[PDB]
């Protein structure tokens, strides 16, 4: 159930048109946050002043707000359709998209939570060691930035195929939205 050479039959152009029709709306919000959240990877003195307070946490909070506002806004419109497939390709992407959306949102939500978490324990001591917290945060956060990156890119592929929209076959296919669990 993969679009390897079977999609090139029904005209693979649908993939090229979708990428352009995407609009880069939702991809813009997250895209700008992708570099922002990953920027904290520095773990340098800069993170010490950003973590000590609700700085980094404040930023990440917005990132999840935009990507969620843009995704839900575009998702609703796409709800009227369900990619020009709905057979064997859409079925597979249906479950994949649901897993990608829950991932990006899960990892991103864990990022802000981890920062504020590791901070509370750090600020509780301060006078104590400064490496133990630097080695941990760098590691824990590292996994959050890595996975989130893989989920973000994968989520763009699924959401890209959903933006295509069929026409009549989708007009009666609420399955798409039914899986999105959104308005």
XYZ file of N, CA, C and O in Angstrom, residues 2 12 31 43 55-56 62 64-65 67 70 74 95 110 116-117 122 128 140 142 144 148 150 152 160-161 176 179-180:
116
model
N 1.801 1.324 -0.941
C 2.692 2.473 -1.051
C 2.649 3.069 -2.454
O 2.548 2.344 -3.444
N 0.976 11.462 -11.497
C 1.647 11.874 -10.261
C 1.695 13.390 -10.104
O 2.111 13.903 -9.066
N 7.375 26.102 10.426
C 8.678 26.299 9.819
C 9.520 27.312 10.569
O 10.712 27.098 10.788
N 22.395 25.288 24.135
C 22.640 24.888 25.516
C 23.750 25.729 26.138
O 24.347 25.341 27.143
N 11.164 32.259 29.476
C 11.510 32.756 28.149
C 11.268 31.688 27.088
O 10.328 31.785 26.299
N 12.122 30.670 27.074
C 12.001 29.583 26.109
C 10.602 28.980 26.135
O 10.021 28.686 25.090
N 3.886 29.623 21.930
C 3.333 30.257 20.739
C 3.456 29.343 19.524
O 2.520 29.211 18.736
N 3.378 26.169 19.241
C 2.314 25.172 19.249
C 0.957 25.823 19.008
O 0.016 25.170 18.557
N 0.862 27.113 19.312
C -0.381 27.853 19.128
C -0.624 28.147 17.650
O -1.734 27.970 17.148
N 1.063 26.743 14.771
C 0.979 25.493 14.026
C -0.370 24.815 14.242
O -0.876 24.122 13.359
N -3.052 27.229 12.431
C -2.939 27.146 10.979
C -3.345 25.762 10.481
O -3.966 25.627 9.426
N -6.672 25.140 8.124
C -6.565 24.511 6.813
C -7.212 23.130 6.817
O -7.782 22.695 5.815
N -4.093 6.871 8.467
C -3.550 6.489 9.765
C -2.185 7.130 9.994
O -1.825 7.456 11.125
N 6.070 18.588 24.637
C 7.002 18.028 25.608
C 8.240 18.909 25.743
O 8.879 18.945 26.795
N 10.878 23.895 31.239
C 10.392 24.420 32.509
C 10.618 23.421 33.639
O 10.825 23.807 34.788
N 10.576 22.136 33.302
C 10.775 21.081 34.289
C 12.218 21.062 34.781
O 12.480 21.216 35.975
N 16.810 22.931 38.547
C 18.072 23.658 38.477
C 18.046 24.890 39.377
O 18.982 25.133 40.138
N 24.730 24.390 43.386
C 25.252 23.052 43.136
C 25.912 22.974 41.763
O 26.139 23.993 41.113
N 18.161 14.973 27.085
C 16.704 14.890 27.041
C 16.146 15.748 25.910
O 15.399 15.263 25.060
N 17.661 16.893 23.410
C 18.184 16.400 22.142
C 17.195 15.442 21.482
O 16.941 15.527 20.280
N 14.030 15.317 22.028
C 12.818 16.064 21.710
C 12.967 16.804 20.384
O 12.011 16.921 19.616
N 10.975 15.290 17.115
C 10.111 16.357 16.623
C 10.444 16.703 15.175
O 9.553 16.983 14.371
N 11.751 14.675 12.913
C 11.312 13.576 12.061
C 9.793 13.577 11.911
O 9.264 13.251 10.848
N 7.876 16.304 12.275
C 7.508 17.526 11.574
C 7.576 17.335 10.062
O 6.670 17.741 9.334
N 0.203 17.159 3.229
C 0.331 17.603 1.846
C -0.599 16.815 0.929
O -1.181 17.368 -0.004
N -0.732 15.521 1.200
C -1.591 14.656 0.398
C -3.063 14.900 0.714
O -3.930 14.719 -0.140
N -11.968 11.204 6.591
C -10.809 12.076 6.745
C -10.872 12.848 8.059
O -10.041 12.652 8.945
N -11.015 11.109 11.424
C -9.739 10.663 11.973
C -8.970 11.832 12.581
O -8.148 11.648 13.479
N -9.244 13.035 12.085
C -8.577 14.234 12.578
C -9.124 14.637 13.945
O -8.442 15.299 14.728
